[PDB]
Amino acid sequence: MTTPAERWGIHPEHFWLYGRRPRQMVEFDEKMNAWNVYGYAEAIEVLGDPGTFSSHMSRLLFTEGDLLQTDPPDHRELRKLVSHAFTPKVVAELEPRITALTQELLDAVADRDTFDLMTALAYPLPVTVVAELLSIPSADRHLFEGWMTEIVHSMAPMRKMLEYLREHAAECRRRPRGDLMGKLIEAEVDGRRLTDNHIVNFAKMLLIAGYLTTTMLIGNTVLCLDSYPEQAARVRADRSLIPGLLEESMRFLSPVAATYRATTRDVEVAGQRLSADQMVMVWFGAANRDARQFAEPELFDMTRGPNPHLGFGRGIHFCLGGPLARMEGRVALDHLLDRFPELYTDPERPPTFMPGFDTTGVSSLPLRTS
Ligand code: HEM
Ligand SMILES: [Mg+2]
Ligand SMILES: [Mg+2]
Ligand SMILES: [Mg+2]
Ligand SMILES: [Mg+2]
């Protein structure tokens, strides 16, 4: 069966998408001036040692409040403080709103013969969750819909969004409430109250981290359903397969193909000697194709497994929006299949993908009913 990668030429440089093995699981590149980690076990080792493999990228050369760029102990405190807003409890509380939105979005395309799934369902979806968590007024949510689209399209839309979030942080200081913003106002990291800049960077981080990759998740999954008809038929007849389907979609096409790490000391990984102050690229996409961990990794199999892929990552930085992303993917797919009995890709209007080399996901997906 022809994979999505072979059908449309998804990231030809991503050799693992075409069943090709890396010569070594840890390889240095002179052109990139960075170490590449391709193996599953080696990835877990790198991700499991944040003291050696820092997340603070500025070391190799503003980021305060941004969890992605923060190491322990500051990371430990800041994550612990915001953890409550990402639990399965918050997932269940937000589901009816996202369900309603999914219905509304699919009402618009219900009678269409052709439609782009990305612009119809995938793009106008993920903002709502983050907007709810950041207590963005419902009237200002359209602004974030526009801003996030522009940044995806390509500095100017980012400037306006940061400008809004600065005043939003100052407004929430005048309005005390038991939400995520309110807890950030009363928060203490390193024995110090977080300034507006800390909260702005956190808000910016959350918006970026909760948008494009969720969009890629929706796109990639439908792309996989179109490539595997026998498996897609089982999904329509058994909707309880959807959670497993989404997990495999992330293994097969990891929206975040790689994350970045920086060495703090001389370290040996898989016999390779890494020097201090060097960039390390941890390829989630490559690690998800490791046959030492996954049986027949070249095959798409929704029935895995359990499926311990690295699409959400691994370690202390493990995706906080993990539970929220799976839910958003589930609701989007379930209702999409309910509304459209038949969905097909168009050879005349082929799907396009994000150019980013550290990503693997759909940018546009034209669909037809017959
Ligand atoms: C399917 C879509 C998604 C993908 C591909 C994805 C990818 C990731 C990955 C791989 C990490 C770990 C990063 C690392 O180790 O360096 C992560 C953490 C994070 N994610 Fe998820 N994610 C997704 C959904 C979300 C959602 C729904 C949110 C929230 C709205 C979110 C916001 C974050 C934030 C703020 C972090 C940083 C947490 C930390 O550093 O402790 N991402 N995202
Ligand atoms: Mg910095
Ligand atoms: Mg700086
Ligand atoms: Mg099949
Ligand atoms: Mg769920």
From atom 21 of ligand 1, which residue's Cα is the shortest distance away?
Answer: 319
- Ligand at minimal distance from the CA of 231 is 4
φ/ψ (deg, to 5) at 359: -130, 155
Task: Give the Cβ contact number of residue 28 at 10 Å.
Answer: 16
CA distance 311 to 255: 7
**Rounded distance, CA 147 to CA 160, Å?**
8
State which of 37, 49, 213 you would mutate to test the pocket of ligand 1, scoring each by most atoms of that ligand within 8 A of its C-beta: 213
Q: Tell me the DSSP string of 315-370.
A: STT--TTHHHHHHHHHHHHHHHHHH-S--EE-SSS--EE---TTB--EEE-EEE--
Tokens of 119: 């612009």
Name the residue of 312, 324, 358 to mutate for ligand 1: max ligand atoms within 8 A of Cβ: 312
Task: Indicate which atom in ligand 1 lies nearest the CA of residue 206.
Answer: 35
Nearest to 24 by CA among 41, 37, 12, 40: 37
What is the separation of C-alpha 36 from the centre of its chain, rounded to a whole number of angstroms? 20
β pairing state of 53-54 and 344-345 = unpaired
Q: How many CB atoms lie within 10 A of CB 83?
A: 10
Residues 6+ apart with CB under 8 A from 264: 51, 52, 53, 54, 59, 276, 277
311 CA → ligand 3 middle, Å: 29
Q: Cβ neighbours of residue 93 under 8 Å, at least 6 residues apart?
A: none
CA torsion 242-285-229-212 (nearest 10°) is 60
DSSP 211-279: THHHHHHHHHHHHHHHH-HHHHHHHHH-GGGHHHHHHHHHHHS-SB-EEEEEESS-EEETTEEEPSS-E
Annotated binding-site residue? 63: yes
The pair of three-digit structure tokens given for residue 180, joined into one six-digit string: 């995520």
Q: What residues are paired with 268 via a beta bridge?
A: 273
By the 10 Å C-beta count (0-12 exposed, 13-18 middle, 19+ buried), 77 is classed as middle
**Ligand 1 pocket list (CB less than 6 A):** 67-68, 79, 129-130, 205-206, 209-210, 213-214, 217, 255-256, 259, 311-313, 317-321, 324-325
Closest CA to 196 of 176, 219, 166: 166
**Alpha-carbon span 263 to 272, nearest angstrom:** 13
Structural domains of the chain, ranges and CATH numbers in brackets: 1-370 (1.10.630.10)
Method: X-ray
